Design a protein around this ligand. Structure first.
Ligand SMILES: CC(C)CCC[C@@H](C)[C@H]1CC[C@H]2[C@@H]3CC=C4C[C@@H](O)CC[C@]4(C)[C@H]3CC[C@]12C
Ligand SMILES: CC(C)CCC[C@@H](C)[C@H]1CC[C@H]2[C@@H]3CC=C4C[C@@H](O)CC[C@]4(C)[C@H]3CC[C@]12C
Ligand SMILES: CC(C)CCC[C@@H](C)[C@H]1CC[C@H]2[C@@H]3CC=C4C[C@@H](O)CC[C@]4(C)[C@H]3CC[C@]12C
Lengths: 311, 319, 324
């Protein structure tokens, strides 16, 4: 009758609501601690006087190794910068006489305070004098060898530690079920080697949907997410992380890039100088998330009440 | 009782159903924030030549993470080397050179002590230490702030987000206009809410803090970007909301934000350093939002919950 | 029979609903928070090395993030390779030992990335043959951890933590520094899990100690120590009862965390128009600070939902009564 028909629907409806979509499991949070170490040397040299060597202490800009590192792939350097009077970059002034520019800092993009003098910048152009980091103004042009292109083969290591807030279950990225592979020499693969934490930069960039040849010329942002999905309805094992290299690029306005400017201030015979670097590098962002969940009497009671209650 | 309970039950269940969006499955987000600052601060000190500070100098760190510090004032102690010199007067004052507990002091540590004390000629006489000499004297904070031009500096926040389990990603920098109009906008809480370029003076002011007192001693300003949108409507309606918080309601005056960093250099084989006491404004940018799309399972759960509540009304009415 | 069954069902309904309400605390509308924590370190570490001159380390030296972050390094040991010239040197024997002339031509080798070779071989130690590479060339980094930590005096350093939080949903904000601001006892406290539970956590040695990590082992080569701040206060009570709870974690199980934390760090300088470098192998203790909590408020909509949430006991109380 009506009662018999409603009884069958109740179990089937509650089966998907509570017997399938958890509810009998107490979901908890997580506390993560990810430390990243790189392994690579980029000796590409320059078309000038002598080669150059870039070790891990040079291209990984957060030295302490934050979860968001800015590993360098290209740069342009203006060496021996000192505060003085010289010719302004033509981006601001193209004067032909002393009346072209007025003394004082410009109301718009300026490189320093002007004393006021239309001096020679060479390059068959004339500009007005300024005071600032002015042995020569920085000239911006992205090189096209992709200077630190050897970073494509650079190696990451994203060992992560999970502790959970109250379940007192400690798990980490290095499962070590095979004892560090017993010969090391593993590279991560979304199909072949999904448990190897030694992702390569080229693979990381490629699996994000971007092109490294474009990300080694200008900058780029790559997101890596580690997701923990502990169930604790089984042995303490079988809980492993899942890495997703996100992209963030999609379509957008092509590839905007990512560059930042940093300086190396040094000192000489009485005066202070500066090595100005315009750095184009790929920024890797690491975000760890977890779900967890363990059996408890209270969630089961709440489900057995609401399940009957929903009737 | 059936007529009265049915009218009431439908109303209360509908309130839980419609207003609370019980049929909607919310989801998290993953975001990346990149900040670009433009502006030059000229702090020509009286009695000497000018000194400019470009973005490579007053931004800590240079990479510009979510929590970055913009220098607004500083005290510099140049040419510091490890050697024998007198203590700062706030460590103790000699009357005779009968030691000052040679070795590291138990309370005020600035270098190991030698037991013989010389004249620190601020009318006082401290005791010799081995450490970074000369000793920093940061009693007088430069007032007004040296980098007063930081008020007009513009902060450009470029936040790009993506909603997991929905395959939708959006950027706070809205793609609706081109240059000469997107490169002219300045943010305003009412006039230009969608403009992503913020001015430091406006950001500090909108947090309830005075920039004049927040530049000399520093401060902490929090910027929150909130992505509160639903996927039921068109994705063009998903827009960010910017709110600036004066963290800890700036107490009453607050000590401000300050830190010490050094520039180490070598002169004739000797290691020196430039000690800086940086008074800057720390900006914290945290992005969080919730979004969802209609699905069959949340609707079924809401229907089951509402139908059960109607049955509870009949049971209560039966009493 | 029916009346008694209905009375029993009502009694058990009331009992379970009351127990759930006293347990679930669902009538409170919990919300997130906005966190802001700033750390101040106070301590001087003096180092003694073979020579006539000691060395001191200011806070601007062993705190590597400098400007301060949630995660920071408080380095307690280091190895320094000074005056790196970036020229032609002898590669480290770890990369490879040559014989006669096995330079194998430049090309940065296959597994030993130490500059680019040159096809010539000359060395420094009793292994007098190790190939000639082009790179930072005072000497290759011969790193051995000093058994007594150089900055072992960091166990007495102070870690003044100033946490500012806010609840935007209910427009309430609190600070790590508890009520009765300033007044007496100026800078005369020290955090203890039982004796002094309300004062910013200090004494790095004690912070490492309250994680089962044996700072003496952590000073030489140790690594990450986690600090968690949980507020967990209900705003229905007085707002002065909302206080932080500090918990220190280890995030370790003694499997591969024994090497701890280390990172390279370089100081570049110029002498006679030549770029040089001071390479540091820095062994430090990383401190991570994580803050979270839920406030909750009485309101009316959560009360209505909990009344609806209480329909679980009242849903099939009569429906299941006739079944049995
Ligand atoms: C016990 C009843 C009343 C509670 C609800 C039962 C359902 C939801 C749950 C509770 C305990 C669960 C079991 C717990 C442990 C395991 C071990 C695993 O190798 C297979 C699944 C299995 C066998 C689970 C199957 C589903 C299960 C039976
Ligand atoms: C009659 C049944 C199916 C109603 C069940 C409630 C749900 C499915 C209804 C209630 C309100 C509805 C929404 C109301 C308004 C809009 C905005 C419009 O631009 C697209 C459709 C959309 C997004 C509707 C989708 C369907 C919707 C979410
Ligand atoms: C309205 C009744 C019948 C049903 C709901 C009960 C609610 C309103 C009751 C149950 C428990 C109560 C709380 C119990 C204890 C305290 C601590 C006291 O220092 C302030 C009031 C406060 C915070 C009460 C506020 C009101 C409260 C939340």
């Amino acid at each position: 009758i009506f009662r018999l028909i409603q009884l069958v629907v109740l179990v089937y409806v509650i089966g998907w609501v509570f017997l399938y979509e958890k509810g009998y499991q107490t979901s908890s949070g997580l506390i993560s601690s990810v430390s990243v170490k790189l392994k690579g040397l980029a000796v590409t040299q320059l078309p000038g006087l002598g080669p150059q060597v870039w070790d891990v202490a040079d291209y990984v800009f957060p030295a302490q190794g934050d979860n968001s590192f800015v590993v360098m792939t290209n740069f342009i350097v203006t060496p021996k910068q000192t505060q003085g009077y010289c010719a302004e970059h033509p981006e601001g002034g193209i004067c032909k006489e002393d009346s072209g520019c007025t003394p004082g800092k410009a109301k718009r993009k300026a490189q320093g305070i002007r004393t006021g003098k239309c001096v020679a910048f060479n390059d068959t152009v004339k500009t007005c004098e300024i005071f600032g980091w002015c042995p020569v103004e920085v000239d911006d042009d992205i090189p096209r060898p992709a200077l630190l292109r050897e970073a494509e083969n650079f190696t990451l290591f994203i060992k992560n530690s999970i502790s959970f807030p109250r379940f007192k279950v400690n798990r980490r990225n290095l499962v070590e079920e095979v004892n560090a592979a017993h010969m090391k020499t593993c590279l991560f693969h979304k199909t072949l080697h999904p448990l190897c934490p030694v992702f390569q930069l080229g693979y990381v960039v490629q699996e994000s949907g971007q092109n490294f040849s474009t990300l080694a010329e200008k900058g780029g942002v790559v997101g890596i997410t580690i997701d923990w999905h502990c169930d604790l309805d089984w042995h303490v094992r079988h809980c492993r992380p899942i890495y997703e290299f996100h992209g963030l690029y999609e379509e957008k306005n092509l590839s905007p890039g990512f560059n930042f400017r940093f300086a190396r201030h040094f000192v000489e015979n009485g005066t202070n100088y500066r090595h100005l670097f315009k750095v184009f590098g790929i920024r890797f962002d690491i975000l760890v998330d977890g779900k967890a969940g363990k059996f408890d009497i209270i969630p089961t009671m709440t489900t057995i009440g609401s399940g009957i209650g929903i009737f």
